[PDB]
């Protein structure tokens, strides 16, 4: 949470570099705030589950959609 | 700010008597923070700022709003 930019860029790749090379397996804490209120965690979080998912496929594309409310 | 509640309940209604029973006077510092990152407790903090201002006034209703973003 230290980490996290909380604007709206949220460009925390760096630190997810290192999520995404933690000996550690992050599926255990990590979702019970990315649910959280906190538009950035939610966020953050919920995208790089799908890099956590398709670390194997080539992603060309991932846009965000903030809706209905 | 602290105690400001910061979910949809947003129950300032006392901490709106605690600044209108303020040994402290607090439209000088309250300002500087209500323009501060973070939307929900904007909303509490804020609202309670229009109670500050319009306490003389008639209310029958207020919405928060949340634009552009």
Redesign the interface.
């Known amino acids: 949470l230290s980490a996290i930019d909380?604007?709206?860029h949220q460009f925390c790749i760096e630190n997810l570099q290192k999520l995404i090379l933690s000996e550690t397996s992050i599926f255990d804490v990590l979702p019970n705030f990315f649910y959280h209120?906190n538009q950035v965690v939610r966020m953050a979080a919920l995208e790089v589950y799908v890099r956590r998912a398709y670390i194997a496929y080539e992603l060309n594309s991932v846009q965000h959609r903030?809706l209905k409310?």
Chains 1, 2 share one sequence.
């Open positions: 909380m604007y709206g209120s903030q409310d």
